[PDB]
RNA sequence: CAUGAGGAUUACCCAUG
RNA sequence: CAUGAGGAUUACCCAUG
RNA sequence: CAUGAGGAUUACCCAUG
RNA sequence: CAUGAGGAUUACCCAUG
């Protein structure tokens, strides 16, 4: 095995899909980027540290760019109009078994499933009410 | 479209599903909890705010109980040994349209989809390798 | 020849064998763990470096769980009462050829072979007498 | 009994084998050396101490020499071109039973068994990858 | 997936090839070493960093040894009579797409192709004329 | 005889090849430039010197431009949006025979051969992982 | 005592606590 | 290290402890 | 951080900004 | 002259020895 593989970050039914690939592992931070110029690429990073004697902490970061072409000094450069940032920290006690961890993954997947509250609010630019 | 409703957090295909229901709305912070004591419950909270002039920011927190060898309704100490904490922060520039936000949600879904690196690592008590 | 693979750490002759698999590669430090919660897992880590101008140095660490009266998947405190730690450091002068290094490995195997003093003492909760 | 006996440190199928014999027990440090001049001998030392109220620690040291003949002041002396050093510390909780300790010995033997990752890297002068 | 793997540095048909294998990846610096005595080995290191707001910079190093045996006082050691050192720095703006980077790589390969001015000068202990 | 000649820097089959031609050889620094606007041209420079009593040192530079058109006040000029810079220094002891130098050249070609770690990382806007 | 993928000419030494 | 419905141009920074 | 056809025993060292 | 995973608009510039 080796879980450091490329994957589809944004699924648009096989066409216009955004896949992200392994690009760096320096300093214990695993990185993935899309096939773009570093200035217009999607970025995903992940790292795990035993933050305490009895805790392990995963730090995950995702960057979604709004691509654009900008004219600087009368020349066109590929760039990002702006970026959206997702920063998440997951603290798991060392006593958690593999099945305990699978439970955490399922909860995170159910949290963001289409039709549920949170993803519905985010997609509609509103709060929860 | 009131979105503050009950939803399935952990989907075990109909049998053994974990449902989470509205439990508090103090200060604009929406809360959902499972039908358990608060020490063993699945908890979800969410709120939105204008973090700065350029950004809006969603803060989402999730608490997942350690289930293996758990004593239902019992007093389990220390608390830190029996709970996992998920802390998510999503920063979105004010220029993002509903379409842009839909894509951001898809990116979060893709990140955690089954078989992908991050969820596979977490579920196996591993890092990236 | 990629050598970062799964291997049998504790050989109980086919039945009850403990296998250890790649679980992390952050910072050049390779890690292997058994299929357990991290509090009860068998862990192995290894790294190499040029300690000085004259030597190269391998740092190998092993963590072995206390199994007698163990509650699988449970919270066992204090941590120090349920785990044994092995810390190995191998210093090798830069002049050592593959042949020299093979002999060093044989010396380590001979040191721990069944029936020999050191392993017999450790297994019997004894010292030398 | 008495586990303070000679043993084969390096096994080359009964011919060219390096056996090591008890040579000193002063100050609670058990020592073994090969039949050589003190300057060209293999050396093994072992000691156990109750390092804490609830821990016992084994300190083991092995020295593998690269033998050579050196001319000093126009005279030939038996000496060591260089030496390889193995230093290991094993911390075992006092609650470990004899079977718990046998588990530690087996893990150390499996760790160094021919064909496995670590001994393969060391013998090939490389890291783990 | 992984590019921190073993590879052929010097290609002498199929036999006499110099292969370099991963050895260490500490502090964002990946290192590869050829087999046998570290003192007579080929070395390759590589790293990337954000040198400035718009630039990423690669630092690559190669060491080619002149294998020889040292004899002092009748003691002979495997050493490097001397070493040839290669140090290269490649700066690439963040606006470069994958296509641009591929072009940069072709330029480097073209610069060193057999028969061209530069590799010809070096191979003949010469300069330009 | 002469090695200060025209040569192919970038090989794109037979058509679209980037050729670089001699332009100047002042102060021991040989320079090659591709055709058309100097502002959009590829540049290669090379020089050798006795860096010390025992060493000779080659300094080589390559510049890869990103061709673009600049427009200011309705006036358009051919320019380079940006440039990628390569700087390499090769030190070779005066004891190196022609055979040794040929080996050094093969090492450089091997380092950059298609499919190998380094050229692969660069071509993909990546680091080592 | 303890911790260090801290060093050594290897039962010594260094740093932090 | 830890905590923040603390900030960011996002592996950085701030406050409290 | 940046520059040097600056030097090295090559992830160190120097000069200038 | 030498070193720097020091920076650049790349035969210039900086820090240290």
mmCIF file of C-alpha atoms in Angstrom, chain F residues 11-114:
data_model
loop_
_atom_site.group_PDB
_atom_site.id
_atom_site.type_symbol
_atom_site.label_atom_id
_atom_site.label_comp_id
_atom_site.label_asym_id
_atom_site.label_seq_id
_atom_site.Cartn_x
_atom_site.Cartn_y
_atom_site.Cartn_z
ATOM 1 C CA UNK F 11 14.202 19.382 -28.520
ATOM 2 C CA UNK F 12 10.576 19.247 -29.737
ATOM 3 C CA UNK F 13 10.907 16.500 -32.308
ATOM 4 C CA UNK F 14 12.237 18.303 -35.370
ATOM 5 C CA UNK F 15 9.886 21.292 -35.445
ATOM 6 C CA UNK F 16 9.466 23.883 -32.703
ATOM 7 C CA UNK F 17 13.029 23.176 -31.564
ATOM 8 C CA UNK F 18 14.695 25.942 -29.613
ATOM 9 C CA UNK F 19 18.154 26.557 -31.028
ATOM 10 C CA UNK F 20 20.685 28.742 -29.315
ATOM 11 C CA UNK F 21 23.574 30.401 -31.222
ATOM 12 C CA UNK F 22 26.896 31.946 -30.134
ATOM 13 C CA UNK F 23 26.679 35.662 -29.469
ATOM 14 C CA UNK F 24 29.531 36.794 -27.284
ATOM 15 C CA UNK F 25 32.658 35.471 -25.583
ATOM 16 C CA UNK F 26 33.969 38.396 -23.542
ATOM 17 C CA UNK F 27 35.981 38.013 -20.321
ATOM 18 C CA UNK F 28 36.031 34.227 -20.394
ATOM 19 C CA UNK F 29 32.235 34.026 -20.395
ATOM 20 C CA UNK F 30 30.731 32.303 -23.439
ATOM 21 C CA UNK F 31 27.150 33.260 -24.251
ATOM 22 C CA UNK F 32 24.487 31.713 -26.506
ATOM 23 C CA UNK F 33 21.149 33.345 -27.421
ATOM 24 C CA UNK F 34 18.143 32.032 -29.356
ATOM 25 C CA UNK F 35 16.898 33.973 -32.390
ATOM 26 C CA UNK F 36 14.427 36.882 -32.713
ATOM 27 C CA UNK F 37 13.766 39.505 -30.031
ATOM 28 C CA UNK F 38 16.538 39.500 -27.441
ATOM 29 C CA UNK F 39 13.750 40.268 -24.954
ATOM 30 C CA UNK F 40 12.075 36.890 -25.585
ATOM 31 C CA UNK F 41 15.221 34.819 -26.115
ATOM 32 C CA UNK F 42 16.670 31.821 -24.322
ATOM 33 C CA UNK F 43 20.105 32.439 -22.853
ATOM 34 C CA UNK F 44 22.975 30.132 -21.931
ATOM 35 C CA UNK F 45 26.330 31.173 -20.500
ATOM 36 C CA UNK F 46 29.366 29.152 -19.468
ATOM 37 C CA UNK F 47 32.858 29.673 -18.051
ATOM 38 C CA UNK F 48 35.703 27.826 -16.310
ATOM 39 C CA UNK F 49 38.326 28.993 -13.874
ATOM 40 C CA UNK F 50 40.933 27.698 -11.459
ATOM 41 C CA UNK F 51 38.890 28.256 -8.266
ATOM 42 C CA UNK F 52 41.834 27.111 -6.175
ATOM 43 C CA UNK F 53 45.141 25.283 -6.426
ATOM 44 C CA UNK F 54 43.465 21.897 -6.846
ATOM 45 C CA UNK F 55 40.096 22.817 -8.306
ATOM 46 C CA UNK F 56 38.666 23.982 -11.581
ATOM 47 C CA UNK F 57 35.129 25.322 -11.504
ATOM 48 C CA UNK F 58 32.445 25.558 -14.181
ATOM 49 C CA UNK F 59 29.692 28.143 -13.854
ATOM 50 C CA UNK F 60 26.709 27.574 -16.146
ATOM 51 C CA UNK F 61 23.496 29.559 -16.504
ATOM 52 C CA UNK F 62 20.292 29.028 -18.408
ATOM 53 C CA UNK F 63 17.276 31.281 -18.807
ATOM 54 C CA UNK F 64 13.915 30.032 -20.035
ATOM 55 C CA UNK F 65 11.456 32.801 -20.942
ATOM 56 C CA UNK F 66 7.691 32.831 -20.935
ATOM 57 C CA UNK F 67 6.932 34.553 -24.230
ATOM 58 C CA UNK F 68 4.225 37.204 -24.066
ATOM 59 C CA UNK F 69 3.148 40.516 -25.601
ATOM 60 C CA UNK F 70 3.122 43.642 -23.471
ATOM 61 C CA UNK F 71 0.605 46.394 -24.173
ATOM 62 C CA UNK F 72 0.910 49.831 -22.641
ATOM 63 C CA UNK F 73 -0.877 52.909 -23.932
ATOM 64 C CA UNK F 74 -1.803 50.901 -27.005
ATOM 65 C CA UNK F 75 1.867 50.241 -27.772
ATOM 66 C CA UNK F 76 2.678 46.541 -27.838
ATOM 67 C CA UNK F 77 6.182 45.139 -27.324
ATOM 68 C CA UNK F 78 7.490 41.550 -27.431
ATOM 69 C CA UNK F 79 8.585 40.671 -23.903
ATOM 70 C CA UNK F 80 9.040 37.875 -21.411
ATOM 71 C CA UNK F 81 6.178 37.677 -18.891
ATOM 72 C CA UNK F 82 8.768 36.150 -16.558
ATOM 73 C CA UNK F 83 11.843 33.934 -16.672
ATOM 74 C CA UNK F 84 12.963 30.709 -15.029
ATOM 75 C CA UNK F 85 16.631 30.765 -13.921
ATOM 76 C CA UNK F 86 19.102 27.894 -13.733
ATOM 77 C CA UNK F 87 22.459 28.349 -12.013
ATOM 78 C CA UNK F 88 24.909 25.502 -11.688
ATOM 79 C CA UNK F 89 28.449 25.201 -10.418
ATOM 80 C CA UNK F 90 30.565 22.142 -11.040
ATOM 81 C CA UNK F 91 33.859 21.701 -9.178
ATOM 82 C CA UNK F 92 36.375 19.190 -10.539
ATOM 83 C CA UNK F 93 39.816 18.431 -8.971
ATOM 84 C CA UNK F 94 42.807 18.651 -11.330
ATOM 85 C CA UNK F 95 43.500 14.957 -10.720
ATOM 86 C CA UNK F 96 40.465 13.949 -12.779
ATOM 87 C CA UNK F 97 41.349 12.191 -16.014
ATOM 88 C CA UNK F 98 39.134 12.301 -19.096
ATOM 89 C CA UNK F 99 37.538 9.046 -17.940
ATOM 90 C CA UNK F 100 36.619 10.621 -14.615
ATOM 91 C CA UNK F 101 35.100 13.648 -16.353
ATOM 92 C CA UNK F 102 33.007 11.443 -18.604
ATOM 93 C CA UNK F 103 31.600 9.771 -15.512
ATOM 94 C CA UNK F 104 30.729 13.157 -14.027
ATOM 95 C CA UNK F 105 28.850 14.014 -17.210
ATOM 96 C CA UNK F 106 26.927 10.737 -17.156
ATOM 97 C CA UNK F 107 25.915 11.454 -13.570
ATOM 98 C CA UNK F 108 24.459 14.797 -14.619
ATOM 99 C CA UNK F 109 22.576 13.253 -17.532
ATOM 100 C CA UNK F 110 21.312 10.446 -15.320
ATOM 101 C CA UNK F 111 20.137 12.896 -12.676
ATOM 102 C CA UNK F 112 17.880 14.562 -15.246
ATOM 103 C CA UNK F 113 16.742 11.584 -17.323
ATOM 104 C CA UNK F 114 12.987 11.259 -17.885
#
